[PDB]
Amino acid sequence: KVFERCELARTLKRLGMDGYRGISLANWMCLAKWESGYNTRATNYNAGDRSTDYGIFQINSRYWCNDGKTPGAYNACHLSCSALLQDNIADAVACAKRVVRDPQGIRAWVAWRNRCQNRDVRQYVQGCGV
């Protein structure tokens, strides 16, 4: 599923992402935008270290979900990476919250540091009714 901007903003709000661990909805929107273009099916194999990024938030298999093919990996979200490829993003959201409960918080994703951090992300949620 490729979410439309405002559709995603309201879905994320309903899921309790607005201000979760201090992270505004617009930050999550900015993150999803750059990680996948709001696409829940997006995947990216990382030939460098044998791990794969999954879903709308491009969550990595080395530590967050289990795909059985990443060496010495962990499954902190305790989900099969398949759960991160569903149209329904409830599981991906559960996992993104798990990610940010760690010290780095939203900084866990480098694309967020590159495209969202210290930027005006208000545009992401404008007119969405959130």
PDB file of N, CA and C in Angstrom, residues 38-110:
ATOM      1  N   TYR A  38       6.034   6.599   1.649  1.00  0.00           N
ATOM      2  CA  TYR A  38       4.794   6.104   2.277  1.00  0.00           C
ATOM      3  C   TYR A  38       4.350   4.747   1.708  1.00  0.00           C
ATOM      4  N   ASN A  39       5.326   3.906   1.363  1.00  0.00           N
ATOM      5  CA  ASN A  39       5.072   2.583   0.774  1.00  0.00           C
ATOM      6  C   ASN A  39       5.366   1.458   1.787  1.00  0.00           C
ATOM      7  N   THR A  40       4.332   0.708   2.175  1.00  0.00           N
ATOM      8  CA  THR A  40       4.477  -0.370   3.166  1.00  0.00           C
ATOM      9  C   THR A  40       5.173  -1.624   2.630  1.00  0.00           C
ATOM     10  N   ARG A  41       5.276  -1.730   1.314  1.00  0.00           N
ATOM     11  CA  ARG A  41       5.894  -2.908   0.713  1.00  0.00           C
ATOM     12  C   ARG A  41       7.366  -2.731   0.409  1.00  0.00           C
ATOM     13  N   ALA A  42       7.848  -1.498   0.493  1.00  0.00           N
ATOM     14  CA  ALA A  42       9.236  -1.185   0.186  1.00  0.00           C
ATOM     15  C   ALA A  42      10.247  -2.054   0.938  1.00  0.00           C
ATOM     16  N   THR A  43      11.267  -2.514   0.225  1.00  0.00           N
ATOM     17  CA  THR A  43      12.323  -3.286   0.858  1.00  0.00           C
ATOM     18  C   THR A  43      13.635  -2.877   0.235  1.00  0.00           C
ATOM     19  N   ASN A  44      14.699  -3.077   0.987  1.00  0.00           N
ATOM     20  CA  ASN A  44      16.011  -2.741   0.481  1.00  0.00           C
ATOM     21  C   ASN A  44      17.009  -3.703   1.073  1.00  0.00           C
ATOM     22  N   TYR A  45      17.673  -4.459   0.207  1.00  0.00           N
ATOM     23  CA  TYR A  45      18.672  -5.409   0.658  1.00  0.00           C
ATOM     24  C   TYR A  45      19.974  -4.631   0.759  1.00  0.00           C
ATOM     25  N   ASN A  46      20.705  -4.848   1.848  1.00  0.00           N
ATOM     26  CA  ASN A  46      21.980  -4.176   2.080  1.00  0.00           C
ATOM     27  C   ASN A  46      23.067  -5.195   1.863  1.00  0.00           C
ATOM     28  N   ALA A  47      23.553  -5.253   0.633  1.00  0.00           N
ATOM     29  CA  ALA A  47      24.610  -6.179   0.244  1.00  0.00           C
ATOM     30  C   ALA A  47      25.856  -6.068   1.125  1.00  0.00           C
ATOM     31  N   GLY A  48      26.108  -4.869   1.634  1.00  0.00           N
ATOM     32  CA  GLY A  48      27.262  -4.646   2.484  1.00  0.00           C
ATOM     33  C   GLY A  48      27.320  -5.504   3.732  1.00  0.00           C
ATOM     34  N   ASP A  49      26.208  -5.596   4.469  1.00  0.00           N
ATOM     35  CA  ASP A  49      26.174  -6.381   5.705  1.00  0.00           C
ATOM     36  C   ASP A  49      25.153  -7.510   5.767  1.00  0.00           C
ATOM     37  N   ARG A  50      24.552  -7.859   4.633  1.00  0.00           N
ATOM     38  CA  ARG A  50      23.584  -8.954   4.572  1.00  0.00           C
ATOM     39  C   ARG A  50      22.231  -8.749   5.279  1.00  0.00           C
ATOM     40  N   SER A  51      21.875  -7.508   5.601  1.00  0.00           N
ATOM     41  CA  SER A  51      20.597  -7.224   6.255  1.00  0.00           C
ATOM     42  C   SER A  51      19.632  -6.592   5.242  1.00  0.00           C
ATOM     43  N   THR A  52      18.346  -6.532   5.584  1.00  0.00           N
ATOM     44  CA  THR A  52      17.329  -5.947   4.707  1.00  0.00           C
ATOM     45  C   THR A  52      16.441  -4.970   5.496  1.00  0.00           C
ATOM     46  N   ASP A  53      16.053  -3.871   4.852  1.00  0.00           N
ATOM     47  CA  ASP A  53      15.183  -2.850   5.454  1.00  0.00           C
ATOM     48  C   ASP A  53      13.766  -3.159   4.980  1.00  0.00           C
ATOM     49  N   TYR A  54      12.799  -3.097   5.896  1.00  0.00           N
ATOM     50  CA  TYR A  54      11.406  -3.449   5.589  1.00  0.00           C
ATOM     51  C   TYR A  54      10.330  -2.404   5.872  1.00  0.00           C
ATOM     52  N   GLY A  55       9.404  -2.266   4.918  1.00  0.00           N
ATOM     53  CA  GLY A  55       8.245  -1.394   5.073  1.00  0.00           C
ATOM     54  C   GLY A  55       8.319   0.105   4.969  1.00  0.00           C
ATOM     55  N   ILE A  56       7.250   0.735   5.442  1.00  0.00           N
ATOM     56  CA  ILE A  56       7.106   2.184   5.398  1.00  0.00           C
ATOM     57  C   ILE A  56       8.166   2.939   6.190  1.00  0.00           C
ATOM     58  N   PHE A  57       8.738   2.281   7.193  1.00  0.00           N
ATOM     59  CA  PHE A  57       9.770   2.921   8.005  1.00  0.00           C
ATOM     60  C   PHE A  57      11.139   2.329   7.727  1.00  0.00           C
ATOM     61  N   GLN A  58      11.191   1.376   6.793  1.00  0.00           N
ATOM     62  CA  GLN A  58      12.443   0.733   6.410  1.00  0.00           C
ATOM     63  C   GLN A  58      13.240   0.266   7.610  1.00  0.00           C
ATOM     64  N   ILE A  59      12.583  -0.506   8.465  1.00  0.00           N
ATOM     65  CA  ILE A  59      13.182  -1.049   9.672  1.00  0.00           C
ATOM     66  C   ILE A  59      14.106  -2.214   9.310  1.00  0.00           C
ATOM     67  N   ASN A  60      15.330  -2.153   9.822  1.00  0.00           N
ATOM     68  CA  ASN A  60      16.371  -3.147   9.551  1.00  0.00           C
ATOM     69  C   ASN A  60      16.281  -4.492  10.307  1.00  0.00           C
ATOM     70  N   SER A  61      16.571  -5.569   9.579  1.00  0.00           N
ATOM     71  CA  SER A  61      16.523  -6.946  10.080  1.00  0.00           C
ATOM     72  C   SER A  61      17.646  -7.391  11.032  1.00  0.00           C
ATOM     73  N   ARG A  62      18.756  -6.662  11.057  1.00  0.00           N
ATOM     74  CA  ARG A  62      19.863  -7.034  11.924  1.00  0.00           C
ATOM     75  C   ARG A  62      19.494  -7.036  13.399  1.00  0.00           C
ATOM     76  N   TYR A  63      18.591  -6.141  13.791  1.00  0.00           N
ATOM     77  CA  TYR A  63      18.218  -6.067  15.192  1.00  0.00           C
ATOM     78  C   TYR A  63      16.723  -6.017  15.510  1.00  0.00           C
ATOM     79  N   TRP A  64      15.910  -5.543  14.568  1.00  0.00           N
ATOM     80  CA  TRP A  64      14.471  -5.335  14.819  1.00  0.00           C
ATOM     81  C   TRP A  64      13.409  -6.374  14.502  1.00  0.00           C
ATOM     82  N   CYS A  65      13.601  -7.142  13.440  1.00  0.00           N
ATOM     83  CA  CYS A  65      12.638  -8.180  13.062  1.00  0.00           C
ATOM     84  C   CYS A  65      13.413  -9.401  12.585  1.00  0.00           C
ATOM     85  N   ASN A  66      12.739 -10.546  12.512  1.00  0.00           N
ATOM     86  CA  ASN A  66      13.408 -11.751  12.058  1.00  0.00           C
ATOM     87  C   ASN A  66      13.035 -12.163  10.651  1.00  0.00           C
ATOM     88  N   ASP A  67      14.054 -12.324   9.812  1.00  0.00           N
ATOM     89  CA  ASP A  67      13.862 -12.773   8.442  1.00  0.00           C
ATOM     90  C   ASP A  67      14.660 -14.051   8.199  1.00  0.00           C
ATOM     91  N   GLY A  68      15.246 -14.582   9.275  1.00  0.00           N
ATOM     92  CA  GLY A  68      16.040 -15.799   9.215  1.00  0.00           C
ATOM     93  C   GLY A  68      17.314 -15.838   8.361  1.00  0.00           C
ATOM     94  N   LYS A  69      17.596 -14.787   7.591  1.00  0.00           N
ATOM     95  CA  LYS A  69      18.781 -14.773   6.731  1.00  0.00           C
ATOM     96  C   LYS A  69      19.824 -13.692   7.064  1.00  0.00           C
ATOM     97  N   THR A  70      19.661 -13.005   8.195  1.00  0.00           N
ATOM     98  CA  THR A  70      20.637 -11.974   8.578  1.00  0.00           C
ATOM     99  C   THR A  70      21.495 -12.598   9.665  1.00  0.00           C
ATOM    100  N   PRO A  71      22.817 -12.711   9.419  1.00  0.00           N
ATOM    101  CA  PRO A  71      23.751 -13.304  10.384  1.00  0.00           C
ATOM    102  C   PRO A  71      23.747 -12.639  11.746  1.00  0.00           C
ATOM    103  N   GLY A  72      23.849 -13.446  12.795  1.00  0.00           N
ATOM    104  CA  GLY A  72      23.877 -12.925  14.160  1.00  0.00           C
ATOM    105  C   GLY A  72      22.887 -11.809  14.473  1.00  0.00           C
ATOM    106  N   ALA A  73      21.705 -11.883  13.869  1.00  0.00           N
ATOM    107  CA  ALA A  73      20.684 -10.869  14.057  1.00  0.00           C
ATOM    108  C   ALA A  73      19.838 -11.075  15.298  1.00  0.00           C
ATOM    109  N   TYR A  74      19.097 -10.033  15.638  1.00  0.00           N
ATOM    110  CA  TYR A  74      18.214 -10.043  16.783  1.00  0.00           C
ATOM    111  C   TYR A  74      16.814  -9.637  16.311  1.00  0.00           C
ATOM    112  N   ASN A  75      15.812  -9.910  17.141  1.00  0.00           N
ATOM    113  CA  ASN A  75      14.423  -9.608  16.817  1.00  0.00           C
ATOM    114  C   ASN A  75      13.788  -8.832  17.982  1.00  0.00           C
ATOM    115  N   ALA A  76      14.246  -7.600  18.185  1.00  0.00           N
ATOM    116  CA  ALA A  76      13.748  -6.773  19.287  1.00  0.00           C
ATOM    117  C   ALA A  76      12.252  -6.500  19.252  1.00  0.00           C
ATOM    118  N   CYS A  77      11.680  -6.361  18.058  1.00  0.00           N
ATOM    119  CA  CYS A  77      10.231  -6.119  17.940  1.00  0.00           C
ATOM    120  C   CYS A  77       9.424  -7.398  18.027  1.00  0.00           C
ATOM    121  N   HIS A  78      10.137  -8.516  18.080  1.00  0.00           N
ATOM    122  CA  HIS A  78       9.555  -9.845  18.133  1.00  0.00           C
ATOM    123  C   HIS A  78       8.444 -10.067  17.128  1.00  0.00           C
ATOM    124  N   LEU A  79       8.827  -9.859  15.870  1.00  0.00           N
ATOM    125  CA  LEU A  79       7.960  -9.999  14.704  1.00  0.00           C
ATOM    126  C   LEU A  79       8.752 -10.562  13.533  1.00  0.00           C
ATOM    127  N   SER A  80       8.064 -11.274  12.645  1.00  0.00           N
ATOM    128  CA  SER A  80       8.696 -11.746  11.420  1.00  0.00           C
ATOM    129  C   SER A  80       8.729 -10.460  10.574  1.00  0.00           C
ATOM    130  N   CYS A  81       9.818 -10.232   9.847  1.00  0.00           N
ATOM    131  CA  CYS A  81       9.914  -9.038   9.016  1.00  0.00           C
ATOM    132  C   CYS A  81       8.715  -8.931   8.070  1.00  0.00           C
ATOM    133  N   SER A  82       8.076 -10.062   7.773  1.00  0.00           N
ATOM    134  CA  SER A  82       6.882 -10.090   6.922  1.00  0.00           C
ATOM    135  C   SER A  82       5.797  -9.154   7.492  1.00  0.00           C
ATOM    136  N   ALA A  83       5.637  -9.141   8.812  1.00  0.00           N
ATOM    137  CA  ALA A  83       4.645  -8.279   9.464  1.00  0.00           C
ATOM    138  C   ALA A  83       4.843  -6.789   9.130  1.00  0.00           C
ATOM    139  N   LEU A  84       6.060  -6.428   8.711  1.00  0.00           N
ATOM    140  CA  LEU A  84       6.417  -5.052   8.350  1.00  0.00           C
ATOM    141  C   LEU A  84       6.164  -4.737   6.883  1.00  0.00           C
ATOM    142  N   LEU A  85       5.549  -5.684   6.179  1.00  0.00           N
ATOM    143  CA  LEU A  85       5.247  -5.523   4.773  1.00  0.00           C
ATOM    144  C   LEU A  85       3.737  -5.536   4.521  1.00  0.00           C
ATOM    145  N   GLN A  86       2.951  -5.478   5.599  1.00  0.00           N
ATOM    146  CA  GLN A  86       1.479  -5.480   5.500  1.00  0.00           C
ATOM    147  C   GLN A  86       0.906  -4.116   5.122  1.00  0.00           C
ATOM    148  N   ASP A  87      -0.316  -4.097   4.590  1.00  0.00           N
ATOM    149  CA  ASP A  87      -0.970  -2.830   4.247  1.00  0.00           C
ATOM    150  C   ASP A  87      -1.355  -2.151   5.555  1.00  0.00           C
ATOM    151  N   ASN A  88      -1.726  -2.969   6.530  1.00  0.00           N
ATOM    152  CA  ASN A  88      -2.089  -2.454   7.829  1.00  0.00           C
ATOM    153  C   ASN A  88      -0.789  -2.234   8.594  1.00  0.00           C
ATOM    154  N   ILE A  89      -0.507  -0.983   8.927  1.00  0.00           N
ATOM    155  CA  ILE A  89       0.742  -0.627   9.599  1.00  0.00           C
ATOM    156  C   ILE A  89       0.798  -0.716  11.114  1.00  0.00           C
ATOM    157  N   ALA A  90      -0.202  -1.327  11.730  1.00  0.00           N
ATOM    158  CA  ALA A  90      -0.216  -1.452  13.190  1.00  0.00           C
ATOM    159  C   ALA A  90       1.069  -2.085  13.744  1.00  0.00           C
ATOM    160  N   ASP A  91       1.518  -3.181  13.142  1.00  0.00           N
ATOM    161  CA  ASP A  91       2.744  -3.840  13.605  1.00  0.00           C
ATOM    162  C   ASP A  91       3.993  -2.988  13.382  1.00  0.00           C
ATOM    163  N   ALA A  92       4.073  -2.331  12.227  1.00  0.00           N
ATOM    164  CA  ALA A  92       5.219  -1.493  11.929  1.00  0.00           C
ATOM    165  C   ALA A  92       5.279  -0.369  12.952  1.00  0.00           C
ATOM    166  N   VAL A  93       4.109   0.138  13.338  1.00  0.00           N
ATOM    167  CA  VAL A  93       4.027   1.210  14.324  1.00  0.00           C
ATOM    168  C   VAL A  93       4.502   0.697  15.677  1.00  0.00           C
ATOM    169  N   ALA A  94       4.078  -0.514  16.042  1.00  0.00           N
ATOM    170  CA  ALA A  94       4.487  -1.130  17.304  1.00  0.00           C
ATOM    171  C   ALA A  94       6.000  -1.235  17.302  1.00  0.00           C
ATOM    172  N   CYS A  95       6.548  -1.624  16.160  1.00  0.00           N
ATOM    173  CA  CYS A  95       7.986  -1.744  16.041  1.00  0.00           C
ATOM    174  C   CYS A  95       8.703  -0.379  16.050  1.00  0.00           C
ATOM    175  N   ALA A  96       8.179   0.626  15.354  1.00  0.00           N
ATOM    176  CA  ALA A  96       8.816   1.951  15.361  1.00  0.00           C
ATOM    177  C   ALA A  96       8.860   2.520  16.789  1.00  0.00           C
ATOM    178  N   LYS A  97       7.806   2.278  17.572  1.00  0.00           N
ATOM    179  CA  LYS A  97       7.769   2.739  18.961  1.00  0.00           C
ATOM    180  C   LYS A  97       8.883   2.036  19.753  1.00  0.00           C
ATOM    181  N   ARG A  98       9.042   0.732  19.523  1.00  0.00           N
ATOM    182  CA  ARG A  98      10.091  -0.064  20.174  1.00  0.00           C
ATOM    183  C   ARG A  98      11.452   0.543  19.832  1.00  0.00           C
ATOM    184  N   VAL A  99      11.655   0.851  18.553  1.00  0.00           N
ATOM    185  CA  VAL A  99      12.903   1.449  18.098  1.00  0.00           C
ATOM    186  C   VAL A  99      13.238   2.702  18.901  1.00  0.00           C
ATOM    187  N   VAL A 100      12.294   3.641  18.974  1.00  0.00           N
ATOM    188  CA  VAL A 100      12.539   4.893  19.686  1.00  0.00           C
ATOM    189  C   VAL A 100      12.536   4.843  21.216  1.00  0.00           C
ATOM    190  N   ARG A 101      12.262   3.687  21.793  1.00  0.00           N
ATOM    191  CA  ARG A 101      12.335   3.574  23.236  1.00  0.00           C
ATOM    192  C   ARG A 101      13.810   3.447  23.630  1.00  0.00           C
ATOM    193  N   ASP A 102      14.658   3.163  22.641  1.00  0.00           N
ATOM    194  CA  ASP A 102      16.095   3.059  22.864  1.00  0.00           C
ATOM    195  C   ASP A 102      16.681   4.485  22.909  1.00  0.00           C
ATOM    196  N   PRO A 103      17.889   4.659  23.487  1.00  0.00           N
ATOM    197  CA  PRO A 103      18.536   5.978  23.589  1.00  0.00           C
ATOM    198  C   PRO A 103      18.488   6.930  22.398  1.00  0.00           C
ATOM    199  N   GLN A 104      18.828   6.449  21.206  1.00  0.00           N
ATOM    200  CA  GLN A 104      18.811   7.303  20.018  1.00  0.00           C
ATOM    201  C   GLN A 104      17.465   7.937  19.721  1.00  0.00           C
ATOM    202  N   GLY A 105      16.382   7.254  20.073  1.00  0.00           N
ATOM    203  CA  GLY A 105      15.073   7.800  19.778  1.00  0.00           C
ATOM    204  C   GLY A 105      14.928   7.860  18.266  1.00  0.00           C
ATOM    205  N   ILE A 106      14.337   8.938  17.756  1.00  0.00           N
ATOM    206  CA  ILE A 106      14.114   9.107  16.320  1.00  0.00           C
ATOM    207  C   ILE A 106      15.417   9.141  15.501  1.00  0.00           C
ATOM    208  N   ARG A 107      16.529   9.434  16.168  1.00  0.00           N
ATOM    209  CA  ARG A 107      17.843   9.482  15.525  1.00  0.00           C
ATOM    210  C   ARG A 107      18.317   8.101  15.044  1.00  0.00           C
ATOM    211  N   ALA A 108      17.595   7.043  15.404  1.00  0.00           N
ATOM    212  CA  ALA A 108      17.971   5.702  14.978  1.00  0.00           C
ATOM    213  C   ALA A 108      18.061   5.613  13.456  1.00  0.00           C
ATOM    214  N   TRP A 109      17.202   6.355  12.754  1.00  0.00           N
ATOM    215  CA  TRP A 109      17.193   6.356  11.293  1.00  0.00           C
ATOM    216  C   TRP A 109      18.045   7.498  10.776  1.00  0.00           C
ATOM    217  N   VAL A 110      19.089   7.169  10.018  1.00  0.00           N
ATOM    218  CA  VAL A 110      19.970   8.200   9.453  1.00  0.00           C
ATOM    219  C   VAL A 110      19.241   9.131   8.465  1.00  0.00           C
TER     220      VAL A 110
END
